[PDB]
Every structure is written in structure tokens, then in C-alpha cells.
Amino acid sequence: QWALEDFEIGRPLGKGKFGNVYLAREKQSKFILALKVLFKAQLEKAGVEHQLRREVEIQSHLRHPNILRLYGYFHDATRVYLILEYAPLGTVYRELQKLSKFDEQRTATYITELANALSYCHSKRVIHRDIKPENLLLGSAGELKIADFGWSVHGTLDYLPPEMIEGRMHDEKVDLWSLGVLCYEFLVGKPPFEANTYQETYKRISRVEFTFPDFVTEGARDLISRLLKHNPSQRPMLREVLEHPWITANSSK
Numbered sequence: 001q002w003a004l005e006d007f008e009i010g011r012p013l014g015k016g017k018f019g020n021v022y023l024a025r026e027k028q029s030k031f032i033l034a035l036k037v038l039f040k041a042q043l044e045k046a047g048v049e050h051q052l053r054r055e056v057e058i059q060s061h062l063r064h065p066n067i068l069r070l071y072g073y074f075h076d077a078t079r080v081y082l083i084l085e086y087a088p089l090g091t092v093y094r095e096l097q098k099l100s101k102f103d104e105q106r107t108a109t110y111i112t113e114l115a116n117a118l119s120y121c122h123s124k125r126v127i128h129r130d131i132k133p134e135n136l137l138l139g140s141a142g143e144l145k146i147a148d149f150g151w152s153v154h155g156t157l158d159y160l161p162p163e164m165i166e167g168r169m170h171d172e173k174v175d176l177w178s179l180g181v182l183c184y185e186f187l188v189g190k191p192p193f194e195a196n197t198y199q200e201t202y203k204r205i206s207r208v209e210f211t212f213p214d215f216v217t218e219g220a221r222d223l224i225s226r227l228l229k230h231n232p233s234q235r236p237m238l239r240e241v242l243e244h245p246w247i248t249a250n251s252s253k
């Protein structure tokens with residue numbers, strides 16, 4: 001439906017082994033968006049083609065304010081292009097480096113926003129699995145938008161729950177572990193299972209070994225603790241996460 005000659009590529013926005021994302025503008029529309037340029041060579045070489053059309057599948061059909069729109073896609077001889085909604089305020093990754101930590105009000109807001117985001121996806125039987133700050137963009141509102149459904153289902157272990165890492169029966173409850181991981185990271189500055197090696201992170205995760213800096217308020221600990229349970233079943237429902245008192249007590253939105 002679209003070709004490259006419909007667009008004007010602007011500033012580079014990012015990297016990621018399979019290519020770069022460039023800001024761009026639709027010629028005849030003046031519309032602003034992010035073009036994610038991916039090569040056919042690299043996608044076949046690193047055996048992924050299958051995952052991509054599943055991203056497009058999922059992300060094309062999804063509709064939520066806290067989920068990065070995928071408007072479409074296309075390709076040529078050399079490469080495949082994904083036409084993505086553009087998120088003015090960049091990644092939450094960046095804002096965490098810049099700010100080192102977030103506060104309880106900013107974290108809970110994001111948590112809420114992310115909760116609702118994830119609440120919608122499970123509804124369509126979809127599991128993200130890869131909720132990490134590098135994957136979380138920001139809109140004009142300053143609002144959280146979950147990008148990238150590369151590893152979505154109907155590398156860095158840091159965000160994966162004990163079940164996935166150990167190679168087991170995994171359900172939509174993985175995303176609550178992630179949310180716990182995310183919540184701690186926002187607050188603390190780094191993930192609760194961070195290690196220097198893959199192998200050590202594996203054990204840290206596999207044995208749910210985390211601890212709280214002193215500044216983490218009591219209710220933060222509580223919500224994280226309930227979310228970071230080795231056994232899926234003990235994990236709150238998204239409802240309960242939204243319902244949690246430290247959330248509501250602090251969750252602006």
C-alpha cells in the first residue's frame with residue numbers, strides 16, 4: 001500500500017541489530033511517524049521473519065492509548081519497513097538514565113498506565129513477555145506506550161520470570177512479574193535481579209533473590225513482593241494491581 005517514496009526520512013531515533021528507526025513524514029499527508037527500517041538479509045540470516053509478521057499481526061490489530069500503534073508495513077528488494085506511531089518524548093529507558101530514579105507518583109502512574117495496557121492485551125489472549133524500559137515509549141501527554149511485540153505470544157533475562165527462564169508452563173501471569181520487575185526498577189534505579197553475568201542473573205531470578213534499599217516505602221515493597229512470587233498463582237490480578245492502595249495513593253492518572 002505504501003512505498004518509500006511516500007515518506008521523507010528525518011532524524012535518526014534509534015538502533016537495534018536489525019536496523020534503525022527514523023522519524024519520517026508522509027509526503028501527501030504531512031503526517032508524522034517513526035519508520036523502523038529492517039533488512040531482509042539480517043532477518044532471514046538470524047532466522048526471525050516468523051516473529052516479525054507476528055509483531056505486525058498483533059500490533060496492527062491492537063488499539064489502545066498506552067500501546068504504540070502500528071499503522072502498517074511494506075518492503076522493497078533490500079529491506080522491510082515498519083510504519084510506526086511516533087512518541088515525542090522518547091523511551092522511559094532514557095528518562096531513567098537522565099533521572100537515575102523515579103518517584104512513587106511517577107512510578108505508580110506508569111504502573112497504572114502499564115497495568116491497563118496489559119489488561120487490554122490479556123483480554124485478546126496476548127502476552128508481551130518483553131516489558132523492559134527500552135520498550136516503553138512516551139507520548140506528548142508524557143504517557144506510557146508499550147512498543148515492540150517482537151517476542152509476543154497468544155538475551156537479557158532481567159525481566160523474565162522464574163518459569164520462563166527455567167523453561168516451563170508460562171501464561172499471561174509472566175507480565176505481572178515483569179510489572180514487579182519494572183516497578184522496582186523505576187523506584188530503585190536498576191532491576192532487582194541485576195547481575196554481572198547471565199548465569200548469576202539466572203540464579204538470582206530462579207531464586208527470587210531481591211532486596212530493597214531503605215528509601216523504598218512500605219507499600220512499594222508490598223506490591224513488588226506480591227508481584228515477584230516464584231509461583232504464578234500468588235500474583236495479583238491486574239485488577240488488584242490497579243486496586244492496590246500504594247497505587248491509588250500515588251497514581252496521578
Ligand SMILES: O=C(Nc1c[nH]nc1-c1nc2ccccc2[nH]1)c1ccccc1
Binds near residue numbers: 013016087088091137
Ligand atoms: O522505534 C523506536 N522508537 C520510537 C518509535 N516511535 N517513536 C519512537 C521514538 N524514539 C525516540 C527517541 C528520542 C525521542 C523521541 C523518540 N520517539 C526505537 C527503536 C530502537 C531503539 C529505540 C527506539
